[PDB]
Amino acid sequence: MISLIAALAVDRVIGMENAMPWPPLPADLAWFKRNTLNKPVIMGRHTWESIGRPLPGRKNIILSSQPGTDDRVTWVKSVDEAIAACGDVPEIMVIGGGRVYEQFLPKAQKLYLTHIDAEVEGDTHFPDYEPDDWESVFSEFHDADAQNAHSYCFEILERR
Ligand SMILES: NC(=O)c1ccc[n+]([C@@H]2O[C@H](COP(=O)([O-])OP(=O)(O)OC[C@H]3O[C@@H](n4cnc5c(N)ncnc54)[C@H](OP(=O)(O)O)[C@@H]3O)[C@@H](O)[C@H]2O)c1
Ligand SMILES: Nc1nc(=O)c2nc(CNc3ccc(C(=O)N[C@@H](CCC(=O)O)C(=O)O)cc3)cnc2[nH]1
Ligand code: NA
Ligand code: NA
Ligand code: NA
């Protein structure tokens, strides 16, 4: 089973100049960590560059046509290879970026989305999905606080 996990601001913005389009939201990072820990994570090369170190407690699989730049993670050259490299696990977590989400969304059976209540500039977007195809099975609204500058809502959707 393939799942996507992403944080989206207004107009589905996820990235700007190969970085996050907002300052860190520690609550969202905790959500991200809790949902990806002990699972394989698939990411695009640009997202690898934006993170810059292996995510601990996870099998890190990087999708790139280019030779790898770090022996601590697994480099693969195709979507099919990325999936194969995860082996026989219950859930593969696809963690972006925009080009990777586009390719895996049609394969996805679950989405873990953080809706970030911010209008910020972006050059990378989460793909358009048809809400009618998905059932919301979880939602939780949070306000901004001293540590998180924007309000946010966690949602989990399952494909009908
Ligand atoms: N808000 C969020 O939830 C979140 C999550 C993830 C990422 N982001 C942001 O999104 C941005 C990155 O997105 P992006 O679309 O520019 O890049 P990306 O999807 O992370 O990486 C794209 C790169 O991955 C490789 N790739 C993708 N598909 C491939 C395939 N089928 N076969 C071989 N290689 C493939 C290619 O690299 P090569 O050129 O090496 O071949 C491609 O240029 C960053 O700003 C990051 O901060 C945000
Ligand atoms: N919900 C969500 N929020 C994100 O910010 C996010 N970001 C990307 C890619 N960007 C990144 C950047 C940094 C870390 C990171 O340093 N994660 C730590 C956080 C642990 C914590 O702060 O509690 C980790 O161990 O997972 C993960 C993804 C992909 N999916 C996302 N999904
Ligand atoms: Na096996
Ligand atoms: Na197998
Ligand atoms: Na429901």
Question: What is the Cα–Cα distance from 17 to 81, expressed in whole angstroms?
Answer: 28
Question: What is the Cα–Cα distance from 121 to 22, expressed in whole angstroms?
Answer: 9
Q: Which amino acid is at 45?
A: R
CATH of the domain at 122: 3.40.430.10
14 among annotated binding-site residues: yes
How was this entry determined? Answer: X-ray
Question: What spacing in Å lies between the alpha carbon of 88 and ligand 5's midpoint?
Answer: 29
Question: What is the Cα–Cα distance from 16 to 101, expressed in whole angstroms?
Answer: 16
Q: Which residues pair with 16 in a beta bridge?
A: 19
Please indicate whether residue 14, judged by its CB atom, sits closer than 6 Å to ligand 1: yes
Question: What is the Cα–Cα distance from 114 to 123, expressed in whole angstroms?
Answer: 18
136: containing domain: 1-160
DSSP state of 30: H
> How would you classify residue 84: left for phi > 0, otherwise alpha for psi between -120 and 50, otherwise beta?
alpha
Question: What is the Cα–Cα distance from 64 to 58, expressed in whole angstroms?
Answer: 19
* Domain tally, the chain: 1
Question: What is the total residue count of the chain?
Answer: 160
45 among annotated binding-site residues: yes
Question: Can you read off the two tokens belonging to residue 21?
Answer: 């389009």
